[PDB]
DNA sequence: TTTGTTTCT
DNA sequence: AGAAACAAA
């Protein structure tokens, strides 16, 4: 139940979530690759824009983030909207709902233009402010999956370019994508937002870090590279979530 | 029907 | 609120 899950996640800790983020999640590997082939500010802007169109995909998330990273490496991006207008219709893994996705990018372009290196630093030190700022730029509910996911992916990109780590705020809830929703239904009849926020508060692990533990493992990522103690805790969690 | 849902009233 | 938004099925 919830108490057992919270105990295991608490033993994994932010330290274990950070390990999974930086060593196991293919999405972080894709971002690391792209960060070597484009300037840091454009990199962060692209990661936010990509997150806001990362829904109802035509491939798995790990496939899609690698397609994004390989596409943009070495490119000279003059307009994020125009870049996506060319990229999406020719993509393999993001072919659905393109007009709607492009309109979202158009809506956020002004906000993205504020993301200088120092503004990125400020938002990484205050991700709750970033959360609300993205939602207000889009005119949407900040509880939505793509907005909360964009904060998570911002934190991946920012830690790469700033060479520093700040934990996600406890108040930002888990991204309710299909993997998380399906898992939650196997575990409980409680709504996922409340279920995972309670586990986050009990364990001390913010929901976006819980997402980093759960989401790669739900896709079948191996835990074998974790050191023995963390590996044991991840094996215990896999018995609950797989 | 939908591989990390949102827009549109 | 929940159907339409596009692709695939």
Author numbering: -2 to 239
Any passages from the paper?
8-Oxoguanine (GO) is a major purine oxidation product in DNA. The major way to remove GO is the base excision repair pathway, usually initiated by a GO-DNA glycosylase. While no enzymes with an A/G specific-DNA glycosylase or a dGOTPase activity have been discovered in these species, a GO-DNA glycosylase called AGOG (for Archaeal GO-DNA Glycosylase) has been initially identified in the hyperthermophilic archaeon Pyrobaculum aerophilum. Despite very low sequence identity, AGOG is structurally similar to eukaryotic and prokaryotic OGG1 and OGG2 GO-DNA glycosylases and, like these two proteins, belongs to the Endo III structural superfamily partly defined by the central helix-hairpin-helix (HhH) element followed by a glycine/proline-rich region and an aspartate (GPD).
In this structure, the protein interacts with the estranged C in the same way as observed for the borohydride-trapped AP lesion with an opposite C while the GO nucleotide is extruded from the DNA helix and stabilized inside the enzyme active site in an anti-conformation similar to that previously observed for the OGG1 and OGG2 enzymes. The space in the DNA double-helix vacated by the flipped GO is partially filled by Q53 and R93 as seen in the crystal structures of the trapped Pab-AGOG-dsDNA-C. First, the O8 atom of the GO-containing DNA is no longer contacted by W62 and second, the ribose moiety is flipped and makes an H-bond with D174. This leads to the repositioning of the sidechain of Q142 (K in wild type) towards the GO-sugar moiety. In the Pab-AGOG/dsDNA-GOC structure, the GO lesion is not the only base extruded from the DNA helix.
